Amino acid sequence: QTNPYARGPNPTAASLEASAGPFTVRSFTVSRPSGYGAGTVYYPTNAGGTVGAIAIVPGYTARQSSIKWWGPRLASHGFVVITIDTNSTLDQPSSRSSQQMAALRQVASLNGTSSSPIYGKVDTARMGVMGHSMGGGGSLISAANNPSLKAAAPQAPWDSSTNFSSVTVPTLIFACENDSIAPVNSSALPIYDSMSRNAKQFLEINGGSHFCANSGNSNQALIGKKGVAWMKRFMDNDTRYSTFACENPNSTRVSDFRTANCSLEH
Numbered sequence: 132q133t134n135p136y137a138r139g140p141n142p143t144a145a146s147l148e149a150s151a152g153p154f155t156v157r158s159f160t161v162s163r164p165s166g167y168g169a170g171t172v173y174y175p176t177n178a179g180g181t182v183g184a185i186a187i188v189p190g191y192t193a194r195q196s197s198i199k200w201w202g203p204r205l206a207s208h209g210f211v212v213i214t215i216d217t218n219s220t221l222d223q224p225s226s227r228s229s230q231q232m233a234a235l236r237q238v239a240s241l242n243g244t245s246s247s248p249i250y251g252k253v254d255t256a257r258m259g260v261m262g263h264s265m266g267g268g269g270s271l272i273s274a275a276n277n278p279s280l281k282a283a284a285p286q287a288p289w290d291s292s293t294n295f296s297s298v299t300v301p302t303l304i305f306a307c308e309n310d311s312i313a314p315v316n317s318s319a320l321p322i323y324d325s326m327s328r329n330a331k332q333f334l335e336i337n338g339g340s341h342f343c344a345n346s347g348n349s350n351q352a353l354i355g356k357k358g359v360a361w362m363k364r365f366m367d368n369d370t371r372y373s374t375f376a377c378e379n380p381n382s383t384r385v386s387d388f389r390t391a392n393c394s395l396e397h
């Protein structure tokens with residue numbers, strides 16, 4: 132049977148590693164942000180049907196610029212993406228999670244607003260969360276509080292507590308090998324090891340600083356391929372992406388790879 136959520140051409144490693152996918156992307160600034168500081172919405176033209184929505188949150192002291200490369204990258208593969216600024220750059224992970232969920236609710240409100248460029252473009256039942264550092268911890272909190280979310284892909288996450296054992300949402304953790312801000316051995320890896328109820332993955336970037344997955348990084352081909360593949364596999368149930376989502380990249384750019392409940396394409 133046809134998967135009703137499958138969008139776009141059949142993927143290749145080259146198409147997923149490119150700076151942009153097949154869809155043309157447009158963007159707008161949210162005029163009156165509700166429950167968060169500011170937002171930019173990225174969306175594809177003629178994706179072939181409604182698409183899922185992803186909300187991305189930066190870390191402590193940081194703004195949209197640090198995570199905005201994901202906006203066009205994911206939207207060009209068939210997603211509506213909102214990148215946000217928080218009410219204060221000093222907000223903690225629980226506050227970042229509340230603001231991330233408020234941003235997804237505003238994308239759902241704009242989907243039902245005839246004057247919005249994303250009117251009727253979103254399947255509001257299929258949503259995902261991403262973010263860096265405290266925004267990564269906020270994404271894990273969003274997944275723990277909202278198991279109705281379809282995917283999570285935080286990067287260099289940090290939270291006071293690394294226990295995310297209740298999470299049932301498919302979660303990809305990008306980690307940065309040499310992170311001295313949210314060290315892998317006390318943040319990303321214990322967070323990954325705590326989750327025994329989900330599809331999950333741990334991808335550690337070789338020699339990476341805490342900022343190894345932020346805008347301007349030198350691994351956008353691999354990181355972008357993995358982020359899009361994970362969101363495609365789990366937000367769209369798209370088994371054309373099972374191998375890209377679940378595979379060990381076998382790359383010199385990766386210093387540690389682990390995955391669970393993640394089957395390759397049969």
Ligand SMILES: [Cl-]
Nearest residue numbers: 190191264265
């Ligand atoms: Cl942070």
